[PDB]
Design a protein around this ligand. Structure first.
Ligand SMILES: Nc1ncnc2c1ncn2[C@H]1C[C@H](O)[C@@H](COP(=O)(O)OP(=O)(O)OP(=O)(O)O)O1
Ligand SMILES: [Ca+2]
Ligand SMILES: [Mg+2]
Length: 430
DNA sequence: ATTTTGACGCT
DNA sequence: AGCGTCAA
């Protein structure tokens, strides 16, 4: 009752760019705008691998991970933009730079946590308090929420999409108590007004559209964001949680899409997030561990305490390349040449990072996979990163991996290498 | 023979 | 530290 926390103490948003790499390429090439199109890496093998897909192309069934040759069978007029290749490998610089554009705009509104190249969480609690003080008891107009859905509404006693959206928003706003500055639902609504402003700023200043979720924590904001993509935002209130979770597959909640989620389903014999409420905290801890158990117990009730971390920049800078099938590296010269290519890209990125962000990486992580090994990585070894020099970094990486070569023959590398990975970590201020 | 990333937990 | 999980 009066002491049961309800996890309604914060306003958190998650902003997620729509079909991000496609929008970057469509901004650059107007011929691709409003067309079925996809972004591909490499071209020789089956037309290249698709990594991003416009919503027009998704209507034909095109998805990520599909080979372009196969996507063309579903959508013969599919347009393609290719990821840049530099030093023999795919180079994602254009997308990293576009990400910086968006992250810098979002940072004007609030502290952000960069969650991925095209996603950031926003802690809006303080901004909401300020805006509520500005509003001075004035009701919130639907005109301030032109792209907002209220999850769960309309309900109770138009057949078009926008009509339904407006009916739900009207029901929500009609029922708000706009005089109580401590009302969580009012706080979320003001949050959504701010997020409309943030999303408009992003689109105005970059050309990119995005979706967003607004709720009381990161997990619900992320779930909310996906409910009405693209180019829309969704408010998930605390009161919406029981109905929303009652038919929500466990795997849809962030962190439960893999083995742990599968084990929750198998061990407990349930399918939906809401079914978790029937277990005690101790029962959940007994199956899934102390941390996961407490997290699940609160999460299934819509409660999560994970903070929005103040971090706008990536914590690592890495460069990776696979060498599948016959392209596996089987000679010392090959291994050294590719370590150099990776190290040259890494040096360029690190030097730019040091100039932009006043920091220096101090550890180099080298990871490889050997042909035959079932594991993704066969070996992961660190060494000191003391100079931003590609030849030094590639030599040090070779030094730390050379003992993996079983071959008695100096010229040959065995088993052949199917992946190389260099990653700069452990940044210090400079 | 999706690939190229990136954060965070475990021991 | 090196390995594993989960997510863009
Ligand atoms: N598995 C992957 N491998 C490589 N790049 C990826 C992968 N998944 C996503 N990306 C890249 C390309 C995407 O445009 C970008 C953001 O990913 P993501 O948010 O999952 O999808 P998306 O932005 O393309 O579409 P959506 O509108 O559904 O968010 O990251
Ligand atoms: Ca996205
Ligand atoms: Mg994303």
């Amino acid at each position: 009752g009066p002491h049961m926390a309800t996890g309604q103490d914060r306003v958190v948003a998650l902003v997620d760019m729509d079909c991000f790499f496609v929008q970057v390429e469509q901004r650059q090439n107007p011929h691709l705008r409003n067309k079925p199109c996809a972004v591909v890496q490499y071209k020789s093998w089956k037309g290249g691998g698709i990594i991003a897909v416009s919503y027009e192309a998704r209507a034909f069934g095109v998805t990520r991970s599909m080979w372009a040759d196969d996507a063309k069978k579903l959508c013969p007029d599919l347009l393609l933009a290719q990821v840049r290749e530099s030093r023999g490998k795919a180079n994602l610089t254009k997308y990293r730079e576009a990400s910086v554009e968006v992250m810098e705009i979002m940072s004007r509104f609030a502290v952000i946590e960069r969650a991925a190249i095209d996603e950031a969480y926003v802690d809006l609690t303080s901004a909401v308090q300020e805006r509520l003080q500005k509003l001075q008891g004035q009701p919130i107009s639907a005109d301030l929420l032109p792209s907002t859905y209220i999850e769960g509404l309309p309900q109770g006693p138009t057949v078009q999409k926008e009509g339904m959206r407006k009916q739900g928003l009207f029901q929500w706003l009609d029922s708000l108590q706009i005089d109580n500055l401590t009302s969580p639902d009012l706080q979320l609504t003001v949050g959504a007004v701010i997020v409309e402003e943030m999303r408009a700023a992003i689109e105005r200043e970059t050309g990119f559209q995005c979706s967003a979720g607004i709720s009381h924590n990161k997990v619900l904001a992320k779930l909310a964001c996906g409910l009405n993509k693209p180019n829309r935002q969704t408010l998930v209130s605390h009161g919406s949680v029981p109905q929303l979770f009652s038919q929500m597959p466990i795997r849809k909640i962030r962190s439960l899409g893999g083995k742990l989620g599968a084990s929750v389903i198998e061990i407990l014999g349930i399918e939906y997030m809401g079914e978790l409420t029937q277990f005690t905290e101790s029962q959940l801890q007994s199956h899934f561990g102390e941390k996961n158990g407490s997290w699940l117990y609160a999460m299934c009730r819509g409660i999560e305490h994970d903070p929005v971390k103040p971090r706008q920049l990536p914590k690592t800078i890495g460069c990776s390349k696979n060498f599948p099938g016959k392209t596996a590296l089987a000679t010392r010269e090959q291994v050294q040449w590719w370590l150099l290519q990776l190290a040259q890209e890494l040096e360029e990125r690190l030097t730019k990072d040091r100039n932009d962000n006043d920091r220096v990486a101090t550890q180099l992580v080298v990871s490889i996979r050997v042909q035959g090994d079932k594991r993704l990585s066969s070996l992961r070894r660190c060494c000191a990163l003391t100079r931003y020099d590609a030849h030094k970094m590639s030599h040090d990486a070779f030094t730390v991996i050379k003992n993996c070569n079983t071959s008695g023959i100096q010229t040959e590398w065995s088993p052949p290498l199917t992946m190389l990975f260099l990653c700069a970590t452990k940044f210090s201020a400079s």
